[PDB]
Symmetry: C2
Subunit: 132 residues, 2 copies
Amino acid sequence: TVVSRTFRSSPHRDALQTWDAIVELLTQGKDGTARSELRAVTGVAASLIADQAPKSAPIVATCDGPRTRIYCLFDEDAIDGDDANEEVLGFEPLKGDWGMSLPCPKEQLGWVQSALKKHSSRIIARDLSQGI
Amino acid sequence: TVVSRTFRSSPHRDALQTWDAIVELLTQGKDGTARSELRAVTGVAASLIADQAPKSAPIVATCDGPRTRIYCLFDEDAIDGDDANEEVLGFEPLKGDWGMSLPCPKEQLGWVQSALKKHSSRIIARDLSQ
Ligand SMILES: [Ca+2]
């Protein structure tokens, strides 16, 4: 099972507000190590959102359960919101042996993958021209 | 008293390696709030370096002592290193009630300032155009 969501980002939300909304979607109010790790990579994740990395390549969460693909909308699409889908997820999106794959322009992968590795082994980045 | 340093960044160093080299310069390997707070903002600082924010507007450190301005070189300048200056500083660059001002593109100031605020009240971002 795979489900998708689409969040309104800049200029409706700034890049950090966008990540915070994604963290809430994926952690659902649970104060645990998963939420702590997602919050720990905020600088990197917001940087990638500000570069519109998730416009055409999703943030992908994997778990003991359905996969979640998260896209972001920018510019007029974010202002309009017609393509947005921010519904609550009908499952625990980071259950069990979870992971997250962040899209990243290939030229930034060097610094991004190192920056992520400081905080997590479950949150990784990929070249946004490829899937997981 | 103001002193300046200029570091070779991408492609000689990636943006994170560049921040780490700056942290080494300003902390001189010593532990404390300074090294800890500088390392805590690595994701934001590296993002700014990757966007060449310190090319024309310096990273500025203040302390009980001289102010340090740090510029970054990119692309051809970083490859040849002609204008580089990475010499150890002759003073404790983050002694006492230290602070750091990071240059930031105006379009990203909103998220960057919120991201830094999570980690530190001593490290702030400014609009690099000003
Ligand atoms: Ca960028």
